[PDB]
Design a protein around this nucleic acid. Structure first.
Lengths: 100, 65, 58, 93
RNA sequence: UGAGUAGCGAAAGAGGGGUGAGAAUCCCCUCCACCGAAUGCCUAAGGUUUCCUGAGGAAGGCUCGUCCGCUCAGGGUUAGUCGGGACCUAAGCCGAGGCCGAAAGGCGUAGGCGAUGGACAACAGGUUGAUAUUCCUGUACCACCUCCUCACCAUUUGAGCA
RNA sequence: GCUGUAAGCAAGCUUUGAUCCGGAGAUUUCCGAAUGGGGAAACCCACCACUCGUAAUGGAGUGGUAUCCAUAUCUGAAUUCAUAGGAUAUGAGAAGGCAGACCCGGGGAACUGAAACAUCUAAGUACCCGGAGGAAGAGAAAGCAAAUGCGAUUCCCUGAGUAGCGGCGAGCGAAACGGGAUCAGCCCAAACCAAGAGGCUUGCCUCUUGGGGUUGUAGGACACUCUGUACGGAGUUACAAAGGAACGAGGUAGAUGAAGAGGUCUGGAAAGGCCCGCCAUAGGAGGUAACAGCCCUGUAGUCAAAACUUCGUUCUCUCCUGAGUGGAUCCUGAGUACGGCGGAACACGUGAAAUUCCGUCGGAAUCCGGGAGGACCAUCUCCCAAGGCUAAAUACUCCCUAGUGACCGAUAGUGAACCAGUACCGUGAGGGAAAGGUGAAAAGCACCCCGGAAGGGGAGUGAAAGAGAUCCUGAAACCGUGUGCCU
């Protein structure tokens, strides 16, 4: 339901409460990248390219239902509504009625 | 692309495009045997652009009936 | 063998013996090969003898 | 249909194509169901360089394998085609 | 378990060098030995890439194994004249109509299929790591058709196809 | 956001609205009923028109070209008419399949029992073959039944394992009455009349078309009185067929959608303990880093389909008279019903055997008639066979949605949770397996050392690395290595 890129809290998990934006979404697997959240060291083969190989510092992406948007005003973790005249179903954030 | 094509006539266009879309397709299968013009998804423009033009023709036979 | 004016056929039944056992018998209906008027012209079909003893034209 | 253009598919660049192309004969695959005289329809009308001869082989497919999954190559049908003297060539260039 | 036991599938290799980490079993050379109306070549029945090159080598090789008919990655079969179909037919088969039979079908005429048969035009060299009476180099041959050239007829009291 | 498996690389495409999901099309090489012909399935070869191209042959595209039947039209043999037959065109005819089922019909066994077996049973079972339909079959009385009678068939329960049948043994075994589900009845044929045609000796009588006419204590014709041709009724499912067009409701896609990160603790992770707040026509389920009503998809309620449908109502359209009175006479189902012989189905095995249906012989009445009332006869009661249509009540599933299991949890459950009718086995019909789980995600082990390389040891990755490719748990047989005590 979340898209790239809205402002995003982390409900639960090891990173319970950090925030960041979305680098990429993966909707068929129901799983979303966030910057700097589930930051995981990965060992990589020396490529082709780059020749460095080494260790990378990426993020493995996060399941969608551990992610909420924010009110722009209160900054609260809020659930989602819809129905917006001339807005093509633009998200009513609860604690009505801010868009996006 | 359809509205760009029903305004095109049968004679003076389906001649000059499809045979030249062949000249875009068949010149590119030769390069697919070589690899010099890399640009690999230019094919899936061309063959798919053939496939929409050729069903306007067979549509107009129903429209001529 | 199945005739024309009616539906006489071979309705196979049992030969009930004395001190019945009893085996099987085909009962094909009576036939003669005679002229019968059809669409123009006759001839020829098998006939049934019940339909030929007084009936349509031989 | 049957056009000259869909009859051919490609040139086949092997070690054989090194020595034959210098001798005014060129390799081409053809479709599975296209005869010798349909090949002379191509090179005359696609390339504008007149055919000396058409010679057509056909191959069966090697039944390759990947893992458990075994299957057969599609069948190929090539054509060594000779051209006249005093007539150029319109290859990759 | 038997048990490190039976078996390792007839049949001479040996020596030097090389490869590689490793060699009796792989390659090369040189001696020797076997078949030689077959263990030679050519090509059917079949097989469907086992062919060639370049790498590997766990697995299949009745032992190793740098090797293979194993694995991969590419490459590999060129026909008017050769075999077969644009020809014909044999036993047989199928079979319009037809005849018999509860049904399904059984048989069969005219017809047609069906070589192991009959007819039938190409040959001698070269050639590659792989194809040849196909590629190629010289001759040829076979049938058909005429943008052409000549030769000879006859104009239905008619050349010719037949 | 997308380029399916597929986890990566290149090349690209998209809120000038893409990827996806539905409707409606178009496209759809070849084989296959294969249908121009041959064929050893996935290929060869034709011919007729038309096109492309070469000077031409050669070559290439586009359709058509089977067989049977039917409607016609030309021809039209021996043989004269004329026919067989031959030629042609027209048929959105039909041959094939498969839901391995259910339902009719034709054929149709055996093994088993009877403690043997041959009458019987098994059993009109399986199997083969023809039919199609979503259902089929049957059906408006020659029906039950014996009174104050019931009123088409079908299905269910009783009736009842009773009446019975049976080397009367094994075993077979009904009906009717009673109560429900479903609930509709009608056309043909025949006389009579009208129109044609077609012959005979005018006369006469013989085929079609159009009315009329549908029966039982008798109806129709015929005749005589009425009565309509509507505004009344019907109608595409029988009742006769057959058309459209509008209103509403489902289905093939959806869309909306309530309430908390409550705090703290344990932890790798809360969805868990404790202390707490809310929503609820929603606490069905399924994910969610671990057991969520409140995180997500959703759920409950509401609402929408441009296009296809399926259903219900209307309008349009279409079509249509019903009765009394009498009986001078004409009809009411012919080589048929019954009867002999021989069989079968009826629960009834040839019997005191009614009844049905077949083969083959005979063979009647046709209202003053005739048939049923378990041999047969009289009386009495029902009822008209010898023609046809008939939805629903019923049996079914390869199926498609939504759902439920005191069903299974990988030697179970389908044979198949896994690229299964695969691999293999067979010439061939056929037989026919095994094979689930890393982790919450690849974070799938960068780097160093040994090693040719697999294979390890450190290093990091994560909670675990003893978790690292049969990858959670890992038992036992087994195979080891150390051993304390005995030899």
């Amino acid at each position: 339901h979340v898209k790239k890129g809205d402002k995003v809290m982390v409900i639960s998990g090891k990173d319970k409460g950090k925030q960041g934006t979305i680098l990429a979404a993966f909707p068929k697997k129901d799983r979303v990248l966030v910057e700097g959240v589930n930051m995981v060291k990965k060992h990589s083969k020396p490529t082709q390219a780059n020749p460095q190989g080494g260790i990378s510092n990426q993020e493995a992406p996060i399941h969608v239902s551990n992610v909420m948007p924010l009110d722009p005003k209160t900054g609260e973790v809020t659930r989602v509504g819809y129905k917006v005249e001339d807005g093509k179903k633009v998200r009513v954030a609860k604690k009505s009625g801010q868009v996006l | 692309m359809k509205a760009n094509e029903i305004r095109d006539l049968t004679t003076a266009e389906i001649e000059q495009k499809v045979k030249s879309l062949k000249e875009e397709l068949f010149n590119l299968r030769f390069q697919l045997a070589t690899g010099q013009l890399e640009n690999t998804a230019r094919i899936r423009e061309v063959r798919k652009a053939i496939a929409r033009m050729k069903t306007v023709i067979r549509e107009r036979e129903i429209a001529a009936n | 063998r199945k005739c024309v004016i009616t539906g006489k056929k071979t309705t196979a039944g049992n030969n009930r013996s004395h001190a019945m056992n009893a085996s099987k018998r085909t009962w094909g209906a009576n036939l003669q090969k005679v002229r019968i008027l059809v669409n123009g012209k006759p001839k020829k079909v098998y006939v049934s003898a019940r339909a030929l003893k007084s009936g349509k034209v031989e | 249909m049957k056009d000259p253009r869909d009859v051919l598919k490609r040139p086949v660049i092997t070690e054989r194509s090194a020595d034959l192309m210098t001798e005014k004969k060129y390799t081409f695959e053809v479709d599975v169901r296209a005869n010798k005289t349909e090949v002379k329809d191509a090179v005359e009308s696609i390339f504008g360089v007149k055919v000396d001869k058409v010679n057509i082989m056909n191959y069966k497919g090697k039944s390759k394998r990947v893992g458990r999954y075994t299957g057969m190559t599609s069948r190929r049908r090539k054509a060594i085609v000779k051209l006249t003297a005093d007539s150029k060539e319109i290859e990759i260039f």
